[PDB]
Amino acid sequence: TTSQKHRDFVAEPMGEKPVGSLAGIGEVLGKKLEERGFDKAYVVLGQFLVLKKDEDLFREWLKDTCGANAKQSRDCFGCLREWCDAFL
Amino acid sequence: MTTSQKHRDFVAEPMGEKPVGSLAGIGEVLGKKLEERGFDKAYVVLGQFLVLKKDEDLFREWLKDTCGANAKQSRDCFGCLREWCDAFL
């Protein structure tokens, strides 16, 4: 199942949307991603793509980088995978 | 239009699973070196461009360091990714 945040994100190009528009990325995670340079959603897309869309490696990277739990990293991965299927 | 037809073909549509050699500036020699470093599809090089926040200097130096691109090759690749993003990202 999906959140509305997910559906909103996968429905359109992300442009300069902030990192907090990604499903799973709330205020606390977003702050920590911004602190480490990932201020916009497309920067996280960048990492997803450098990692060749690998679910295990991306979700681990997200845990290591901002402390995302399993649900948060699942939600974020799925929203980027579905965005890519639609637009990349 | 002063871009390559190759640039124009890349920026005209989503890149999907296109190989790295579809990118402007990336001929067979650079493409092989990128592939050997794991950058086998154009979207992986897109990924690096985005992780570098689309910064021209950082991206072009990364390309130089990674596959030996000269100035013209790295400018062409950068420009093709920048215009693709403006169209589709």
mmCIF file of C-alpha atoms in Angstrom:
data_model
loop_
_atom_site.group_PDB
_atom_site.id
_atom_site.type_symbol
_atom_site.label_atom_id
_atom_site.label_comp_id
_atom_site.label_asym_id
_atom_site.label_seq_id
_atom_site.Cartn_x
_atom_site.Cartn_y
_atom_site.Cartn_z
ATOM 1 C CA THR A 1 0.000 0.000 0.000
ATOM 2 C CA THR A 2 0.987 3.615 -0.581
ATOM 3 C CA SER A 3 0.674 6.954 1.137
ATOM 4 C CA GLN A 4 -0.672 10.038 -0.588
ATOM 5 C CA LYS A 5 2.823 11.523 -0.211
ATOM 6 C CA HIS A 6 4.096 8.636 -2.333
ATOM 7 C CA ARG A 7 1.403 9.059 -4.960
ATOM 8 C CA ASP A 8 1.977 12.818 -5.100
ATOM 9 C CA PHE A 9 5.709 12.292 -5.627
ATOM 10 C CA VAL A 10 5.455 9.619 -8.339
ATOM 11 C CA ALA A 11 2.854 11.522 -10.351
ATOM 12 C CA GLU A 12 5.094 14.290 -11.700
ATOM 13 C CA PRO A 13 8.694 15.407 -12.324
ATOM 14 C CA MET A 14 10.386 16.253 -9.034
ATOM 15 C CA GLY A 15 12.262 19.357 -10.153
ATOM 16 C CA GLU A 16 13.654 21.172 -7.131
ATOM 17 C CA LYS A 17 11.328 19.532 -4.614
ATOM 18 C CA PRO A 18 12.970 19.347 -1.175
ATOM 19 C CA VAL A 19 14.170 16.075 0.235
ATOM 20 C CA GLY A 20 11.132 15.999 2.529
ATOM 21 C CA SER A 21 8.796 15.416 -0.410
ATOM 22 C CA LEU A 22 10.025 11.825 -0.612
ATOM 23 C CA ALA A 23 7.812 9.191 0.981
ATOM 24 C CA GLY A 24 9.322 8.099 4.250
ATOM 25 C CA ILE A 25 11.395 11.264 4.719
ATOM 26 C CA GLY A 26 9.892 13.236 7.586
ATOM 27 C CA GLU A 27 11.181 16.267 9.410
ATOM 28 C CA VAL A 28 13.880 14.490 11.415
ATOM 29 C CA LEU A 29 15.256 12.431 8.524
ATOM 30 C CA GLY A 30 15.046 15.434 6.198
ATOM 31 C CA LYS A 31 17.104 17.579 8.572
ATOM 32 C CA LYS A 32 19.839 14.937 8.749
ATOM 33 C CA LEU A 33 19.855 14.509 4.970
ATOM 34 C CA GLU A 34 20.163 18.269 4.495
ATOM 35 C CA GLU A 35 23.033 18.429 6.999
ATOM 36 C CA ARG A 36 24.966 15.941 4.860
ATOM 37 C CA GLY A 37 24.303 17.750 1.572
ATOM 38 C CA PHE A 38 21.129 15.999 0.390
ATOM 39 C CA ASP A 39 18.888 19.045 0.426
ATOM 40 C CA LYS A 40 16.739 18.252 -2.647
ATOM 41 C CA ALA A 41 14.920 15.064 -3.655
ATOM 42 C CA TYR A 42 16.958 14.819 -6.849
ATOM 43 C CA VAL A 43 20.191 14.447 -4.863
ATOM 44 C CA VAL A 44 18.783 11.317 -3.227
ATOM 45 C CA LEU A 45 17.607 10.161 -6.653
ATOM 46 C CA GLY A 46 21.226 10.657 -7.664
ATOM 47 C CA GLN A 47 22.423 8.237 -5.005
ATOM 48 C CA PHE A 48 19.679 5.743 -5.923
ATOM 49 C CA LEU A 49 20.940 5.831 -9.538
ATOM 50 C CA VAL A 50 24.682 5.665 -8.673
ATOM 51 C CA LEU A 51 23.789 2.552 -6.739
ATOM 52 C CA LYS A 52 22.099 1.132 -9.882
ATOM 53 C CA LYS A 53 18.699 1.134 -8.182
ATOM 54 C CA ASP A 54 19.829 -1.629 -5.796
ATOM 55 C CA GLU A 55 17.216 -1.907 -3.073
ATOM 56 C CA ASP A 56 19.405 -3.457 -0.370
ATOM 57 C CA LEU A 57 22.322 -1.041 -0.924
ATOM 58 C CA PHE A 58 20.147 2.073 -1.201
ATOM 59 C CA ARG A 59 18.109 1.303 1.912
ATOM 60 C CA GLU A 60 21.309 0.572 3.855
ATOM 61 C CA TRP A 61 22.860 3.798 2.604
ATOM 62 C CA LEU A 62 19.764 5.676 3.771
ATOM 63 C CA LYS A 63 19.944 4.034 7.213
ATOM 64 C CA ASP A 64 23.664 4.840 7.479
ATOM 65 C CA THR A 65 23.228 8.424 6.295
ATOM 66 C CA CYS A 66 20.139 9.671 8.166
ATOM 67 C CA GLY A 67 19.053 6.843 10.484
ATOM 68 C CA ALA A 68 15.981 5.799 8.527
ATOM 69 C CA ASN A 69 14.192 2.770 9.931
ATOM 70 C CA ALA A 70 13.057 -0.132 7.767
ATOM 71 C CA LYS A 71 9.639 1.378 7.005
ATOM 72 C CA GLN A 72 11.043 4.808 6.173
ATOM 73 C CA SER A 73 13.702 3.336 3.862
ATOM 74 C CA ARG A 74 11.129 1.045 2.235
ATOM 75 C CA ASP A 75 8.831 3.992 1.546
ATOM 76 C CA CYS A 76 11.634 6.156 0.194
ATOM 77 C CA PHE A 77 13.045 3.419 -2.059
ATOM 78 C CA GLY A 78 9.610 2.562 -3.445
ATOM 79 C CA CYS A 79 8.761 6.152 -4.300
ATOM 80 C CA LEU A 80 12.057 6.589 -6.154
ATOM 81 C CA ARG A 81 11.700 3.262 -7.989
ATOM 82 C CA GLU A 82 8.187 4.145 -9.116
ATOM 83 C CA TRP A 83 9.207 7.704 -10.083
ATOM 84 C CA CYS A 84 12.015 6.294 -12.200
ATOM 85 C CA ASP A 85 9.688 3.794 -13.920
ATOM 86 C CA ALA A 86 7.463 6.730 -14.917
ATOM 87 C CA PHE A 87 9.983 9.416 -15.881
ATOM 88 C CA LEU A 88 13.545 8.174 -16.358
ATOM 89 C CA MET B 1 21.587 24.650 -33.097
ATOM 90 C CA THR B 2 25.283 24.119 -32.369
ATOM 91 C CA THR B 3 24.858 20.916 -30.355
ATOM 92 C CA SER B 4 25.655 17.511 -31.754
ATOM 93 C CA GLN B 5 22.843 15.463 -33.248
ATOM 94 C CA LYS B 6 23.884 13.020 -30.533
ATOM 95 C CA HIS B 7 23.135 15.607 -27.853
ATOM 96 C CA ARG B 8 19.853 16.384 -29.570
ATOM 97 C CA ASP B 9 18.876 12.701 -29.696
ATOM 98 C CA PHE B 10 19.660 12.215 -26.008
ATOM 99 C CA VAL B 11 17.820 15.291 -24.752
ATOM 100 C CA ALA B 12 14.730 14.566 -26.844
ATOM 101 C CA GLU B 13 13.367 11.687 -24.743
ATOM 102 C CA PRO B 14 13.697 9.837 -21.406
ATOM 103 C CA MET B 15 16.932 7.901 -21.293
ATOM 104 C CA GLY B 16 15.626 4.631 -19.863
ATOM 105 C CA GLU B 17 18.304 1.946 -20.122
ATOM 106 C CA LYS B 18 20.407 3.700 -22.752
ATOM 107 C CA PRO B 19 24.126 2.843 -22.523
ATOM 108 C CA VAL B 20 26.646 5.396 -21.394
ATOM 109 C CA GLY B 21 27.806 5.843 -24.986
ATOM 110 C CA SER B 22 24.484 7.531 -25.840
ATOM 111 C CA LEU B 23 25.707 10.590 -23.941
ATOM 112 C CA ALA B 24 27.227 13.456 -25.891
ATOM 113 C CA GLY B 25 30.980 13.537 -25.524
ATOM 114 C CA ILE B 26 31.193 9.847 -24.571
ATOM 115 C CA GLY B 27 32.739 7.994 -27.503
ATOM 116 C CA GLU B 28 33.781 4.358 -27.525
ATOM 117 C CA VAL B 29 37.048 4.958 -25.670
ATOM 118 C CA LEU B 30 35.560 6.959 -22.787
ATOM 119 C CA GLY B 31 32.531 4.654 -22.710
ATOM 120 C CA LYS B 32 34.658 1.573 -22.176
ATOM 121 C CA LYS B 33 36.548 3.217 -19.308
ATOM 122 C CA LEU B 34 33.273 4.308 -17.694
ATOM 123 C CA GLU B 35 31.853 0.804 -18.056
ATOM 124 C CA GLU B 36 34.952 -0.721 -16.468
ATOM 125 C CA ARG B 37 34.414 1.566 -13.452
ATOM 126 C CA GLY B 38 30.769 0.444 -13.137
ATOM 127 C CA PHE B 39 29.141 3.382 -14.981
ATOM 128 C CA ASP B 40 27.563 1.218 -17.641
ATOM 129 C CA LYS B 41 24.270 2.958 -18.311
ATOM 130 C CA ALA B 42 23.664 6.626 -18.948
ATOM 131 C CA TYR B 43 21.441 6.877 -15.884
ATOM 132 C CA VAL B 44 24.393 5.942 -13.642
ATOM 133 C CA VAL B 45 26.313 8.979 -14.921
ATOM 134 C CA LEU B 46 23.120 10.986 -14.468
ATOM 135 C CA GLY B 47 23.217 9.762 -10.868
ATOM 136 C CA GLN B 48 26.703 11.136 -10.321
ATOM 137 C CA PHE B 49 25.697 14.449 -11.934
ATOM 138 C CA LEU B 50 22.815 14.709 -9.484
ATOM 139 C CA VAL B 51 24.795 13.612 -6.425
ATOM 140 C CA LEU B 52 27.170 16.441 -7.323
ATOM 141 C CA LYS B 53 24.168 18.829 -7.318
ATOM 142 C CA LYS B 54 24.643 19.457 -11.044
ATOM 143 C CA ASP B 55 27.850 21.384 -10.374
ATOM 144 C CA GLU B 56 29.770 21.822 -13.629
ATOM 145 C CA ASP B 57 33.245 21.991 -12.106
ATOM 146 C CA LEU B 58 32.829 18.966 -9.855
ATOM 147 C CA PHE B 59 31.160 16.871 -12.551
ATOM 148 C CA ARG B 60 33.631 17.669 -15.307
ATOM 149 C CA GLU B 61 36.578 16.941 -13.003
ATOM 150 C CA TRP B 62 34.971 13.687 -11.852
ATOM 151 C CA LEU B 63 34.611 12.683 -15.525
ATOM 152 C CA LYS B 64 38.226 13.620 -16.206
ATOM 153 C CA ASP B 65 39.432 11.663 -13.183
ATOM 154 C CA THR B 66 37.238 8.662 -13.975
ATOM 155 C CA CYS B 67 37.706 8.174 -17.723
ATOM 156 C CA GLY B 68 40.242 10.769 -18.887
ATOM 157 C CA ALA B 69 37.748 13.035 -20.637
ATOM 158 C CA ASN B 70 39.221 16.190 -22.158
ATOM 159 C CA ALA B 71 37.580 19.610 -21.802
ATOM 160 C CA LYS B 72 35.372 19.342 -24.877
ATOM 161 C CA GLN B 73 34.185 15.834 -24.013
ATOM 162 C CA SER B 74 33.344 16.760 -20.446
ATOM 163 C CA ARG B 75 31.560 19.960 -21.508
ATOM 164 C CA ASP B 76 29.487 18.032 -24.020
ATOM 165 C CA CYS B 77 28.551 15.358 -21.529
ATOM 166 C CA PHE B 78 27.739 17.944 -18.855
ATOM 167 C CA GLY B 79 25.597 19.966 -21.288
ATOM 168 C CA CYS B 80 23.661 16.901 -22.433
ATOM 169 C CA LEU B 81 22.845 15.908 -18.844
ATOM 170 C CA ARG B 82 21.960 19.479 -17.871
ATOM 171 C CA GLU B 83 19.544 19.875 -20.771
ATOM 172 C CA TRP B 84 18.053 16.424 -20.193
ATOM 173 C CA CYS B 85 17.365 17.374 -16.595
ATOM 174 C CA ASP B 86 15.805 20.702 -17.606
ATOM 175 C CA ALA B 87 13.470 18.741 -19.895
ATOM 176 C CA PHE B 88 12.591 15.731 -17.757
ATOM 177 C CA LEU B 89 13.674 15.938 -14.098
#
